[PDB]
Amino acid sequence: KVYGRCELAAAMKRLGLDNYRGYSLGNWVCAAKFESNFNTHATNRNTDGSTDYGILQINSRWWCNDGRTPGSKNLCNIPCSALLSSDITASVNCAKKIASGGNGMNAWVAWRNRCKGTDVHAWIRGCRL
Ligand SMILES: CC(=O)N[C@@H]1[C@@H](O)[C@H](O[C@@H]2O[C@H](CO)[C@@H](O[C@@H]3O[C@H](CO)[C@@H](O)[C@H](O)[C@H]3NC(C)=O)[C@H](O)[C@H]2NC(C)=O)[C@@H](CO)O[C@H]1O
């Protein structure tokens, strides 16, 4: 599924991401835009053998288990295929766990390069939440 911006913001809001660990909602909408262009099916394979899965590009070396990544820690205790669902619940619950690390949202490279530091509140304006 490819989510609309406001559609995704609302889905994320109802799952507890607004101001999760300080981070306002537009941070997560901006992270999903530059990570996958709001597409739940996005996958990117990395040269170390891990793959990034779903709308928030969660990595299989640390967070989910896909069967093919040497040394997967599977810290979110999920199959990576669960992250390719049109339902984002599994992705958001894992993302909360990722964001709880010392690095916070810097675990998302696209958010640190294209979102961090800007007025990310723009990503939810016009959405009547
Ligand atoms: C969205 C996504 O999947 N992003 C992936 C990143 O999460 C991943 O970054 C690595 O994440 C781990 C776990 O949060 C980092 O480990 C922490 O590192 C510090 C020192 O930097 C250490 O003291 C902590 O104890 C340790 N935390 C845990 C829970 O073990 C690790 O440093 C991150 N590494 C880098 C280079 O950022 C990266 C790379 O595997 O992939 C993203 O796709």
Describe the structure.
With 129 residues, the chain is mainly alpha-helical. The protein has one domain: Orthogonal Bundle (Lysozyme). The protein contains four helices and three strands; from the N terminus they run H-H-E-E-E-H-H. The protein has helices at residues 5-13, 25-36, 89-99, 109-114; strands at 43-45, 51-53, 58-59. The protein has a three-stranded antiparallel sheet with strand order 1-2-3. A hairpin with a 5-residue loop joins strand 1 and strand 2. Helix 1 packs across helix 2. The longest helix is centred in the N-terminal third of the chain and has 12 residues, at 25-36. It binds a molecule of 3 linked components (NAG-NAG-NAG). The site of a molecule of 3 linked components (NAG-NAG-NAG) has 12 residues, from strand 3. Disulfide bonds join 6-127, 30-115, 64-80, 76-94. It is found in: Secreted. This is Lysozyme C. Belongs to the glycosyl hydrolase 22 family. Lysozymes have primarily a bacteriolytic function; those in tissues and body fluids are associated with the monocyte-macrophage system and enhance the activity of immunoagents.
Q: Which descriptors apply to this entry?
A:
129 residues, binds a molecule of 3 linked components (NAG-NAG-NAG), three-stranded antiparallel sheet, Lysozyme, 4 helices, mainly alpha
What is this entry, summarized?
Monomer. With 129 residues, the protein is mainly α. The chain is built from four helices and three strands, in the order ααβββαα.
